[PDB]
Amino acid sequence: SKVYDPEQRKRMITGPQWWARCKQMNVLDSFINYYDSEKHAENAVIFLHGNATSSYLWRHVVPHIEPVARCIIPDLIGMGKSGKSGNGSYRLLDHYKYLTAWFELLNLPKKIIFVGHAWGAALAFHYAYEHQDRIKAIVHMESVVDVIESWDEWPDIEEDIALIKSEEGEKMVLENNFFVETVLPSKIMRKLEPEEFAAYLEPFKEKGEVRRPTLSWPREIPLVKGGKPDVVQIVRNYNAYLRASDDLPKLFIESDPGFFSNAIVEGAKKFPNTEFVKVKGLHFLQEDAPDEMGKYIKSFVERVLKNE
Ligand SMILES: Nc1ncc(-c2ccc(O)cc2)nc1Cc1ccccc1
Ligand SMILES: [Cl-]
Numbered sequence: 001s002k003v004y005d006p007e008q009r010k011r012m013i014t015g016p017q018w019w020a021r022c023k024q025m026n027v028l029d030s031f032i033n034y035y036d037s038e039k040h041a042e043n044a045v046i047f048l049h050g051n052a053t054s055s056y057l058w059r060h061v062v063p064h065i066e067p068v069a070r071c072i073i074p075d076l077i078g079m080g081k082s083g084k085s086g087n088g089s090y091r092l093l094d095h096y097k098y099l100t101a102w103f104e105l106l107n108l109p110k111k112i113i114f115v116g117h118a119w120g121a122a123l124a125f126h127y128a129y130e131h132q133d134r135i136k137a138i139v140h141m142e143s144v145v146d147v148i149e150s151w152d153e154w155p156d157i158e159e160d161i162a163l164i165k166s167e168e169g170e171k172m173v174l175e176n177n178f179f180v181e182t183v184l185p186s187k188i189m190r191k192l193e194p195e196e197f198a199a200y201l202e203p204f205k206e207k208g209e210v211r212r213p214t215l216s217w218p219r220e221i222p223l224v225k226g227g228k229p230d231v232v233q234i235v236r237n238y239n240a241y242l243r244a245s246d247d248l249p250k251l252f253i254e255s256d257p258g259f260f261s262n263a264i265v266e267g268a269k270k271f272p273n274t275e276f277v278k279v280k281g282l283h284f285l286q287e288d289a290p291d292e293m294g295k296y297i298k299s300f301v302e303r304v305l306k307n308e
């Protein structure tokens, strides 16, 4: 494979280098792999990836925030180096079951800070809706902010989701690894070095059912027309909560030109007490502007801690 950027290779963190910095813990009938910076545990900043990725997504972002608060970054169940779900189901509520059980083992403070990307933001938002007294602040980006009606730059979203929900979508993902091999690199502006792509491919290198989480995630999409009713209700509930959460400081990181960002920025602006920043990127913006993102998050967390 070609290599691309001598400067990026100089500071690159491979899959094995990242995993060697992680911890593991049994959770319910399985286990979670996670990064835990440990220090400054009076606060906790929990970073949640979404589909196709793992805790590895945050590897160049977290160093900026670790000096200010304990940073904890799980691989969602069935993803990264975590164990598999006991029944092989990977819906939003399955992820939420393992995630919340893991939280109970971490010795968390009363009020937690969440940093969410994409479906990881949905998990944070649903946790917040159900634990409204446990939230210090929320950072979100390229996130599931609301139900999805008509996205101007994705006029075919309903047909594309119908394909993914059909048996053909199963072949695209389980046989051809569509989300890791096609969507992931297409929505990073730079070229990943081979070792970086290998870290994302590793959990899903074999064909078949091991790739189920990457198919189940898009099938959860909260489309008004045809979205899974339980997810649609979850998102409607947490959206209305966020719209009235005047006391809850938020940071929204817009991606320029972005992937979801164009459609969701209006929705993010409907949540009170939001600071707005912008970085270059498509969907997986951590791969294009990790240091700018890390510095913005660090500043935001520092301000939140000063004001309290
Ligand atoms: N994240 C996605 N990226 C790409 C595609 C996709 C699907 C089919 C296709 O032919 C090309 C791309 N789907 C999602 C699913 C999704 C989840 C939540 C919000 C919005 C989208
Ligand atoms: Cl998805």
Ligand SMILES: [Mg+2]
Pocket (backbone or CB within 6 Å): 007
């Ligand atoms: Mg040089």
Ligand SMILES: [Mg+2]
Pocket (backbone or CB within 6 Å): 156
């Ligand atoms: Mg198309």
